[model samples]
Target: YFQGSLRETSEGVILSVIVAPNARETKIVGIDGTRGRVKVNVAAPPVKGKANKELMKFFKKLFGAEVVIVRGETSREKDLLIKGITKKEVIEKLEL
Candidate 1:
């Protein structure tokens, strides 16, 4: 299930995301059941860390929390720690 991608730790809630850059706009596409990750299209091109920055900004705006790339900094699959949020709240935010 996609819910497997969301984990609640002592620090915060962690989310797994599979991203594709250079899209027309940044938006959530759907969930990748095979990968157990949320699929997203990033508006920024994958260059000079712009894509990662855009991803962080998007998560911050959506979740209203401090977002950080915890892993896969240069990879399509990334793990993000969203501070000041819970797993249940994140699931509601995703509306899934």
Candidate 2:
């Protein structure tokens, strides 16, 4: 299951998004019995955690949050628990 903390921020909910770089597309899905894809373009190749780092940076800037990768360091799918935010805020920010 995906889990994380919530913290309030100026820009909105600062989410720590688990990124799947080099994927075909960008989307969200339910954690149980559901699969989703979020397509993101990364200049860096998948090597030495470069893509993951880049992904974090992208989210940090894009969402205006202090993003960090909490789990799934070496896998296509990961769990990123973000501090200083809420679920509703995330939905609104992403316009889901």
- Writing each residue's lDDT as its tens digit, candidate 2 over 1-96 gives 232323345533433333445545333333332333333455567888888777777666555566766666786655454456566655555543
> Which pairs clash in model 1?
none
Q: Which stretches of candidate 1 lie over 4 Å from their true place?
A: none
Candidate 1: tens digits of C-alpha lDDT, residues 34-53? 88899999999999999999
- What's the lDDT for residue 51 in model 1? 95
In order, the Cα lDDT scores of the candidates are 0.92, 0.52
Task: Return the TM-score for each candidate structure.
Answer: 0.94, 0.58
The clash count of every prediction, one per candidate, is: 0, 9
